[PDB]
Amino acid sequence: ASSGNRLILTQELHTMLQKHLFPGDGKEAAAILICNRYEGGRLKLLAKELILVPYEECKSRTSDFIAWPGNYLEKAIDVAEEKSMSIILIHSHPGGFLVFSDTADSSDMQTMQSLFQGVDAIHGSAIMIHSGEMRARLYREGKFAENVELVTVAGDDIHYWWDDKTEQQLKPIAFTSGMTDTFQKLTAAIIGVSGTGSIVAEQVARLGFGEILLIDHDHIEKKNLNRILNSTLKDALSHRPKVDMFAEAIRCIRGEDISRPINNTIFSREAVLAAANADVLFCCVDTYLARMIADRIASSFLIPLLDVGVKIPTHVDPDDGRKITDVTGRIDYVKPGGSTLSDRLVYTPELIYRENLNAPSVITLNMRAASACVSEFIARCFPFREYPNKRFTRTFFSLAGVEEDYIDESSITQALNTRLAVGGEEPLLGLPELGDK
């Protein structure tokens, strides 16, 4: 679950690619995906640019073959040369093809060697079927090496196309052992082992996730024994780090070294580069800085993001004295290429600036929010609602007003997303404080 490689496409790229590869005439088509890479605990290919080969530019197109010109390999190499990007050829299901110049044709093998000669990097060849599922093979030194373990698109719904898929195996439904089998192959990152984060982490561990990253610098103490799952008085009296405490708890619960404690703030190279390995991010730190870092990790490394927060404002009523003003929670799902936490004003530059220049809490509210947060991931991997998951991109609930509201992704304005799929380009996350010094 930790070292399997991945090819990640954005929903918007995948939709364009699927339309191009399946126009409706049942004939093969061709396209080229240019990808950045993350190479930490695993190889992750990050789809960045898409070149569609126009049908009229192809010498021929049939139900099981296509011939397209080699100038398109040159166009892909032009895009990839500077940053040694990975180049993935993609064809409609059957996948037979050749690349022709004026003088010579190149087989699939010859074309992959040609790609390597133009750009020293891992390249690949991928196939898509009409439904959109994708399989991919990687070429090292221009030669066939290994299949991609997982091709994934995290859109409104989240799709996992595994290399070991069974032919007559239907997708599992939510809350079943087939859900567990999926999660067992995935890595989850919990940013903040907090009131909400310890609960998200607990659910993630017991749901069967295969690797669980825990990122937090804080420690157990008497004041948070009312909230932090698995914490003990002995932990508090020694100020045991939260990540070490919870990592030990997970190893006892699951009986295996699946927890990865990161004793640091998310605003660190250690944390960012660990988190980049994850297949899903849960942000549970109640600071504007933390949510922005989580936001930028999600976009840069194409990781779906679930951000959760709760608030209990209070005020002094002239008659009764102090009063609970409201009891609220918020869940935000962010897909790569969809609206960001910034777009949603979960943070702003001014709020982060004022935060870095310079309130009751309760387990019941934390659990109410954390349960909804992990349920949102389940619903998007294994749809079970009567409405499209897109309708529930944002969730706002109030236990005092006893109301719950949902915001559709389509209602949210999107700014230009410059960091999408840039991976670990320095300065990391565009922040000099995280850059290689």
Among 41, 118, 192, 208, binds its own copies (CB under 8 A): 208
Residue 414 interacts with, from its own copies, Na ion, none (CB under 5-8 Å by kind): Na ion
Neighbour count for residue 167 (Cβ, 10 Å): 4
Of the pair 139, 382, the CB lying nearest its own copies is at 382
- Specify whether the backbone of 432 is left (phi greater than 0), alpha (psi in -120 to 50) or beta: alpha
Shortest CB 241 distance to its own copies, Å? 18
| Contact set for Na ion, span 410-429 (CB under 5 A) | 414, 417
Residue ranges in 220-279 assigned as alpha helix (H) = 233-238, 242-254, 269-275
Q: Is the dihedral of CA 399, 400, 402, 407 positive or negative?
A: negative
Shortest CB 392 distance to its own copies, Å? 7
Going by their DSSP bridges, the two strands 150-154 and 321-324 should be labelled as: unpaired
Q: Is 72 in the site for its own copies (CB under 8 A)?
A: no
Beta bridge mates, 105:
100
Shortest CB 223 distance to its own copies, Å? 10
Among 15-23, 26-34, 358-366, 422-430, which window interacts with its own copies (CB under 8 A)? Answer: 358-366
The contact mask relative to Na ion for 375-414 (x = CB under 5 A, - = no) is ---------------------------------------x
Taking alpha carbons only, the member of 46, 48, 58, 69 closest to residue 20 is: 58
Residue 377 has what DSSP assignment? H
- Measured N-to-C along each axis, helices 197-206 and 242-254 cross at an angle, to the nearest 10 degrees, of 20
Of the pair 124, 337, the CB lying nearest Na ion is at 337
Among 23, 324, 411, 435, binds its own copies (CB under 8 A): 324
Q: Is 387 in the site for its own copies (CB under 8 A)?
A: yes
Asked if residues 235 and 227 have their Cβ atoms less than 8 Å apart, the reply is no
Rounded CA-CA distance 12/338 in Å is 9
Binding interface with its own copies (CB under 8 A): 170, 173-176, 180, 199, 202-203, 206-208, 225-227, 229-234, 252-255, 312, 314, 321-324, 327, 360-365, 367-368, 370-372, 374-375, 378-379, 384-387, 391-392, 399-402, 404, 406
Binding interface with Na ion (CB under 5 A): 337, 414, 417
